[PDB]
Amino acid sequence: NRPNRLIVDEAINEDNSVVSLSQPKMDELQLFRGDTVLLKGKKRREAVCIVLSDDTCSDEKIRMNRVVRNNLRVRLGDVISIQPCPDVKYGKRIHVLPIDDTVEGITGNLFEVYLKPYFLEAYRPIRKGDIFLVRGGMRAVEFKVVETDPSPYCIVAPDTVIHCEGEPIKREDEEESLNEVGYDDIGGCRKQLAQIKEMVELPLRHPALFKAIGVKPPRGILLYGPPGTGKTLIARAVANETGAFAFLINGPEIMSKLAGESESNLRKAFEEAEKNAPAIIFIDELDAIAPKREKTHGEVERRIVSQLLTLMDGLKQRAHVIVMAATNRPNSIDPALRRFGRFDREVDIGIPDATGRLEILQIHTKNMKLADDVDLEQVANETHGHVGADLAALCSEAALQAIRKKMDLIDLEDETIDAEVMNSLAVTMDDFRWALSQSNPSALRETVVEVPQVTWEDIGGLEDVKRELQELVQYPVEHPDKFLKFGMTPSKGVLFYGPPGCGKTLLAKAIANECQANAISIKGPELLTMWFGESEANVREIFDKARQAAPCVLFFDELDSIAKARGGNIGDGGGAADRVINQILTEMDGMSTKKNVFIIGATNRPDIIDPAILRPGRLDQLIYIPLPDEKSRVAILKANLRKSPVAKDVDLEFLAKMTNGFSGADLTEICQRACKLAIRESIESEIRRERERQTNPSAMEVEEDDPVPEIRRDHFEEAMRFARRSVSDNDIRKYEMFAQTLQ
Amino acid sequence: NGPEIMSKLAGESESNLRKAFEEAEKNAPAIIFIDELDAIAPKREKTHGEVERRIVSQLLTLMDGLKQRAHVIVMAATNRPNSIDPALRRFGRFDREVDIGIPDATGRLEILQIHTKNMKLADDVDLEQVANETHGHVGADLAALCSEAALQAIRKKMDLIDLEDETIDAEVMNSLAVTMDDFRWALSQSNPSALRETVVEVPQVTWEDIGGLEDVKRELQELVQYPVEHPDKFLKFGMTPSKGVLFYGPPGCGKTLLAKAIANECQANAISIKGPELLTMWFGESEANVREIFDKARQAAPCVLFFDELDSIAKARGGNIGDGGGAADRVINQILTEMDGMSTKKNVFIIGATNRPDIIDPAILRPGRLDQLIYIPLPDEKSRVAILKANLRKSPVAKDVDLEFLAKMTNGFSGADLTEICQRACKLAIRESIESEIRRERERQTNPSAMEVEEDDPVPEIRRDHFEEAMRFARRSVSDNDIRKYEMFAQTLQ
C-alpha cells in the first residue's frame, strides 16, 4: 500500500549514474532533475545518482541499472523506496580508484586513461556503495568506494585533487563476499533458521516497539551441531540481514596470547560491541575457553572463566546486545553458563536430510557445467552421513578428476588453451559415482532425526492396527478440545509382540509419516553397549533429544536382548530387573504428555519382559502383528519389485496363491534370489557372445538385443525350488497361549 | 559476587573482600550478601592450588572477627549444603540454614500475578488453571512463559502491522490483548528446569477420594493426628509414641492414596519414594543419599515419608528362594540406621508398602520400628461407588447411567480397573464425537450449502452404551490364589 513501494526491473542504460522515472509516479514524487534521488532498498546500501533517464518502459516497475541489484538488492521481484534528496553538498571530490581489473595491463594513473571521460557535466551525484561499470576500453571494470573526505555524498567538481596511489584489490572482494552472505547462501537448515529469525530479527529492527511492552528479550543463544554444519555463516547472514554490527571471537586465538593479554582482548570485544548500535557477538569453539572444570587444572583457566561470567552478567538489557556461541555438545561446558541471565536458550543444527543436501549441492554446483545425465537428486539421496563440508569435497573431487582424466594430455602443457578447454570442460555422472566411491562420511554414528517416507502403500493390511494407531497418535494432536470436554488423560505407550521380522519397524515409521512427525530408532546393540559399558546416563540424552524434536515415535526393538543375555525364562538367580530398564522407567515417569512424544516397543519373546513396565502410567497396551494373510504379501511384493523391471508372464497373485504362510523377509529373499539369477544369466550370455565376437574376426557385426532386460517366470520357479517357512507352528501356538483368554 | 572476586588478580582478590567488611563495619546495622559462595569456598577436595586456600583462610578469619558489638549479619547463597568446605558450617560461623524450595500451586499463582500487570488479559484467561499445570517451574521460568505468550500474541496478531514503521504500533499495543490459547501454546513449548527434585507439599487428596476403610481411618487418626494434639496425655500416662506402620495386600488398591490423605487431614507435608530410586542406589552403590532424604524430612516436619515397592530389591535377587543370601542388603541397613537415630519429638512418620510381604526382612518389624502391619482389602460395596465418583468428577455424565448399577454388576475388582473402564468409555465417546463431526463436515463440504447453521453436539456427555461396551472387555486383575495367600499371611493372630 506504500506508494513508493514498487518493483524494479530490467535496465538498458549501461551507466549506473542514471535512475529511472515514472511520470505517473513523478507526479506522486517531487522528483526533480539534478544530482540525486535517494532510492532506498535492503541492507541500507543504495544507488543514488542522477535521475530521469527513463520512462522508456512500462510503469509500476522502475528501471534501475542491473548493477544496483548485486548492491542495494539481491535479485528481481524486489522493491525500491525512491524519495528525492537532491542538492547535496559539494565537498572536495569523490574517490577515484579501480578495484579488480585494472592492474591487468597499463595502469598509469588509473584515472586519466579510462575513467576521466565520464565525470563530465554529470559530476558524480553518488552515494558511497554505488558500484557500476566505467572504462575507456573493453567497458567492464568496477568503481568502488575507498576514501571519504566528506561523510555524506557530494557532487564533484574540477580543480580538485585525487590520489590513485591505492591499488586494485581482490582479497577485499572475498571479504565483501562474506558481507554478501545471505539467507539463500546458507542452506540445509530451514526449521532451525526460522527460530533464530523470530528470536533476533523482531527485537532488532524495532527496539522501542518491543520495549513498550517491556518483556524480556533473550541475552544469549547456544548452537549445538557436529563440525561442518555451518555456524559462522548463520551468524554472518543474520548480521547482514539485520544491517547490524558484528564481532568475531576465536577461542584458540584468545588462548594463544599471554596470560596478561588474554583478558584485554575479551574486555575490548564487549567494550566495542557496546559502543555501537544493536550488535551481535559470535564466539566460536567455546570449549577452548570454558570447558568442564573437572578437566581443567590451573590458574589462568578459571581466571578467564570468571571474567567471561562477570562480563556476561553486566549487560543491563539497555544496550541491545545479543551473543551466540558454537559448541559441539551441551555436556561439554561448565554448567555455570547454562543458567538464567546467562546462556538460557539453545538451538540444535543437526544433520541435513535428503531435502537439505539437495540445496547444498545446488549452492555449491554453480560453475560445474553439468551434462544431461547428472541426476543431482539420486546423488543427494545416496549421501548418508555427510555434512556441509563433505559435499564441497565431493564436488571438488569429481571436478578435478574430470579435469585430469579428460585433459590427461592437454593440461600438462602450458598454454592459454587450458582456460579455453575449461570452457569445453564438463562433468558426467560416472565422475560423481566414482567420487562417491572413496567418500568417507564424517558422521555415521550420530542419532538420526527425520520424517521417514514409508507409507502404508509399503504394507497392505493390518486395518484394525491402522485404526488403533490413528486413535493413539493422530487424533490427540488434532482435537485436544475433546479431551478437555471429557476430561481425558492421554495414553503414552504401546507394546508389540509376535514372530520375528514381520514389519514392526515398518509400522512405527508409517505412523510418523502419516503424522509428518520425526522418528528415532534404537536397537538392542545399543542396550548391550550401555549394559557392558555400565553407562546408562546415555539414556538421559536420548529422551532429552526426543524432547527437543517433538513429536517423535521413540522405538525400542529387541527389548528382550538384555533379558536373553542372562539366559531365558529361567535365566539367572535374579528376576527381571536391570539398570537400563530402571532408567527407562524413570524417564517415562518424569515426562509430560503435553509435548506429544510417543514411545513404542517391540520383541519376539514377550514372556521374558519385566511386567514392571506394563502398569498404568506406561505402555499398558499390547498389540500382536500376525503373519500376513492373503494379498498382504501381494502389497509386500509390489513394494519389493517396484525398483526392478518385471514382465507380464509373472503374476504376483500367483506367487501369493502358492504360498500358504510365510514371514516378511522370506519374500524379499525370494525376490533377491530371482534378481541374482537374472544378473548371472545376463552376464554369462553377454560374455559368451563377446567371446564369439572376439574369436570370430567379424570387424562389423552390430547386434544390441539384451536377452533379458527384465525377469521371467523361470527365475521365480527356480526360487520356489529352495525356500523356507522361517517360523514353526509351535511358535504360533505359543503366541496363541500368550493371547490367553482376554475376558 | 563470587565470580567477580575470582576474576581479579591474586593480590587484588583479598583487598576487595577486606574492604567489604571494613565498609560494613563503618555504618549502622548493615547486612552483607554473598552470591554463589561455591566459587570462593568449594569442597577442598576439588580445589588444587594456593590462592584458593589463601582466600578461604581470609574468609574464615574475617568471619571470626565480629565480636557481636557491631550488629552485622551475613547471608550467603548456595545450591546445596554438601557443596562447601565444612569449616564454614560451624558454631560462630554460618550456623543457621533456610531452604527456599520449589513454589507449589499456591505460590506460582502469586508469581503469575506479580509478573502479569501489563498483560491486558481477556475473560477466558484462567490464571488458576495455568498455575496448576505448571509442574517443575521456578521463579524465572514463569517470566519466560509470560514473555513467550506475549510475544507470540504480538506477532501472530500484528503479522501485517508491526512490520511497518509507524507510531500506530504503540497505538495498536493499546488494542493488544492476550488469549488463553497463547498461554496453552507457550506451555506446549516449555521445558521446566527442575523435574528431578524431591517434592515437599501438602497433598489435597481427602477421604472423599476414597470411600470406605473406616477402621483404617480411625487407626491412622490415632497414630498421626492424636499425638500432635494432646502430648499431655502421653506425659500423664508416660507413653512412648510409635513411629511406623507397614502395609501389605494386592496391587494398586489405593495405598499411595491413603498416606497423602492423612497428611491432608493433618495439613502436613508429604514425601513419596518408589522402587526405581532404590534400584538406582543399589546398582549405583550410593546409599549415602539415604542420609539426604531423612535430613530433608527433618527440616520439613511433620512429614509422612512413604516407601512403596519395598520388595523391589528383594525380588531383584529372585523371590523367596532368591540367592544364597538371606534378606539383608545395604539400603535397608541405612534405613534402619537412620530410623534408629531419629527422635520422635520432631513428629516425622514413616510408612511402607508392598504386595509380597513374605520376602521382606523381618529385621525391620521389631520394636523401635514399624512393628505394625495393616492390610488394605479389595473394595467392598459402595467403596467403588466413591472411587467412580472421584474418577468421573472431571467429566460430564448423563442420568441414564447409574454408578450404583456399575458397582452392582461387578463382584470384586481392583482400584485401577475401574479407572481403565472409565477411560475406555471416554475414548469411545471421543472417537464417536470426532467421527460424527467429521462426517457432518464432509456432508456440508460436498454439498454447496453456503448457509446451513446447525450446532447440536450429538454427544457433549456420555451415555450407557459406552459403559456396556466397556463391560464387554474387562478383567479381574487379581486371582483368588492371591486372596487365599493373603488369608494365610493373616495367620492366627491369637
Residue numbers in the entry:
A (entry chain A): 21 to 763
B (entry chain F): 270 to 763
Paper text:
In eukaryotes p97, also known as valosin-containing protein (VCP), or Cdc48 in S. Cerevisiae, is one of the most conserved and abundant AAA (ATPases associated with a variety of cellular activities) family member. In fact, p97/Cdc48 acts as an unfoldase that couples the extraction of proteins from membranes and complexes to ATP hydrolysis. p97/Cdc48 is classified as type II AAA ATPase, as each protomer contains two consecutive ATPase modules and assembles to a homohexamer with a two stacked rings architecture. The NTDs are essential for the recruitment of most cofactors, as well as for substrate binding, whereas the ATPase domains regulate ATP binding and hydrolysis, controlling cofactors binding and substrate processing.
We generated three mutants of the human p97: F266A (D1), F539A (D2) and the double mutant F266A F539A (D1 & D2). To structurally study the effects of the D1/D2 mutations on p97 we used single particle cryo-EM on both the single (F266A, D1) and the double (F266A F539A, D1-D2) mutated proteins and obtained 3D reconstitutions at 2.7 Å and 3.4 Å, respectively. Overall, in both structures the D1 ring highly resembles the conformation of wild type p97 bound to ATPγS. Three conclusions may be deduced from these findings: (1) The D1 (F266A) mutation is dominant over the D2 (F539) mutation and thus imposes on the double mutant the same conformation as was determined for the F266A mutant. (2) In accordance with the all-“up” conformation of the NTDs, the affinity toward UN of these mutants (F266A and F266A F539A) in the absence of ATP resembled that of the wild type p97 in the presence of ATPγS.
